[PDB]
Short mmCIF file of all heavy atoms in Angstrom, two decimals:
data_model
loop_
_atom_site.label_atom_id
_atom_site.label_comp_id
_atom_site.label_asym_id
_atom_site.label_seq_id
_atom_site.Cartn_x
_atom_site.Cartn_y
_atom_site.Cartn_z
N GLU A 279 -28.45 14.97 -4.93
CA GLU A 279 -29.57 15.55 -5.64
C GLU A 279 -30.36 14.50 -6.41
O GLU A 279 -31.60 14.51 -6.39
CB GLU A 279 -29.04 16.61 -6.60
CG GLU A 279 -30.12 17.40 -7.26
CD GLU A 279 -29.58 18.63 -7.97
OE1 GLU A 279 -28.35 18.91 -7.90
OE2 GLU A 279 -30.41 19.34 -8.58
N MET A 280 -29.67 13.60 -7.10
CA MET A 280 -30.40 12.63 -7.91
C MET A 280 -31.14 11.63 -7.03
O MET A 280 -32.22 11.18 -7.39
CB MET A 280 -29.49 11.88 -8.86
CG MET A 280 -28.80 12.76 -9.88
SD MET A 280 -29.91 13.86 -10.77
CE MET A 280 -30.95 12.72 -11.66
N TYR A 281 -30.57 11.28 -5.88
CA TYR A 281 -31.28 10.41 -4.94
C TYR A 281 -32.56 11.08 -4.49
O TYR A 281 -33.63 10.48 -4.49
CB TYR A 281 -30.37 10.13 -3.75
CG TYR A 281 -30.91 9.13 -2.75
CD1 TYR A 281 -30.68 7.78 -2.90
CD2 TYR A 281 -31.57 9.55 -1.61
CE1 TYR A 281 -31.11 6.87 -1.98
CE2 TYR A 281 -32.04 8.66 -0.71
CZ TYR A 281 -31.79 7.31 -0.89
OH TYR A 281 -32.23 6.39 0.03
N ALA A 282 -32.47 12.36 -4.13
CA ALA A 282 -33.67 13.03 -3.67
C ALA A 282 -34.71 13.16 -4.78
O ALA A 282 -35.90 12.95 -4.56
CB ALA A 282 -33.30 14.39 -3.10
N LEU A 283 -34.27 13.52 -5.99
CA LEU A 283 -35.19 13.71 -7.09
C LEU A 283 -35.86 12.41 -7.52
O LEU A 283 -36.92 12.45 -8.14
CB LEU A 283 -34.48 14.31 -8.29
CG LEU A 283 -34.05 15.77 -8.17
CD1 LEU A 283 -33.14 16.13 -9.32
CD2 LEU A 283 -35.30 16.65 -8.20
N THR A 284 -35.26 11.27 -7.19
CA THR A 284 -35.85 9.97 -7.51
C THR A 284 -36.42 9.29 -6.27
O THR A 284 -36.74 8.10 -6.32
CB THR A 284 -34.85 9.07 -8.23
OG1 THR A 284 -33.67 8.93 -7.44
CG2 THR A 284 -34.48 9.61 -9.62
N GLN A 285 -36.55 10.03 -5.17
CA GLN A 285 -37.17 9.54 -3.95
C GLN A 285 -36.48 8.30 -3.41
O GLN A 285 -37.10 7.48 -2.71
CB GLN A 285 -38.67 9.29 -4.17
CG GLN A 285 -39.42 10.58 -4.33
CD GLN A 285 -39.23 11.23 -5.67
OE1 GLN A 285 -39.33 10.58 -6.71
NE2 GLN A 285 -38.97 12.54 -5.66
N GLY A 286 -35.19 8.16 -3.68
CA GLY A 286 -34.43 7.01 -3.23
C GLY A 286 -34.83 5.69 -3.83
O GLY A 286 -34.36 4.66 -3.36
N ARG A 287 -35.63 5.69 -4.88
CA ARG A 287 -36.17 4.49 -5.48
C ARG A 287 -35.37 4.00 -6.67
O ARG A 287 -35.70 2.95 -7.23
CB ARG A 287 -37.60 4.74 -5.93
CG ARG A 287 -38.50 5.16 -4.79
CD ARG A 287 -39.95 5.33 -5.25
N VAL A 288 -34.33 4.73 -7.07
CA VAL A 288 -33.55 4.44 -8.26
C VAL A 288 -32.12 4.21 -7.82
O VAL A 288 -31.45 5.14 -7.34
CB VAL A 288 -33.63 5.59 -9.28
CG1 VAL A 288 -32.73 5.32 -10.49
CG2 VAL A 288 -35.07 5.76 -9.76
N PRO A 289 -31.60 3.00 -7.94
CA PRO A 289 -30.23 2.75 -7.51
C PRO A 289 -29.24 3.66 -8.20
O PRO A 289 -29.31 3.87 -9.41
CB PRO A 289 -29.99 1.30 -7.93
CG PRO A 289 -31.35 0.69 -7.94
CD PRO A 289 -32.30 1.76 -8.34
N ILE A 290 -28.27 4.14 -7.43
CA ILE A 290 -27.21 5.00 -7.94
C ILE A 290 -25.87 4.32 -7.70
O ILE A 290 -25.60 3.83 -6.60
CB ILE A 290 -27.25 6.38 -7.25
CG1 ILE A 290 -28.54 7.10 -7.65
CG2 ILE A 290 -26.01 7.18 -7.63
CD1 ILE A 290 -28.89 8.29 -6.78
N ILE A 291 -25.04 4.31 -8.73
CA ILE A 291 -23.64 3.96 -8.60
C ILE A 291 -22.90 5.28 -8.52
O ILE A 291 -22.96 6.08 -9.45
CB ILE A 291 -23.16 3.13 -9.79
CG1 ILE A 291 -24.00 1.87 -9.91
CG2 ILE A 291 -21.68 2.81 -9.64
CD1 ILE A 291 -23.56 0.90 -11.00
N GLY A 292 -22.22 5.51 -7.41
CA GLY A 292 -21.58 6.79 -7.15
C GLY A 292 -20.12 6.72 -7.55
O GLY A 292 -19.42 5.80 -7.17
N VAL A 293 -19.67 7.73 -8.28
CA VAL A 293 -18.32 7.70 -8.81
C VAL A 293 -17.82 9.13 -8.99
O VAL A 293 -18.58 10.04 -9.32
CB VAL A 293 -18.24 6.81 -10.07
CG1 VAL A 293 -19.31 7.18 -11.09
CG2 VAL A 293 -16.85 6.83 -10.70
#
Side-chain angles (χ1 to χ4, degrees), residues 279-286 288-293:
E279 187 167 358
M280 298 309 296
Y281 186 88
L283 289 170
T284 56
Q285 290 75 48
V288 176
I290 294 164
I291 302 184
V293 51

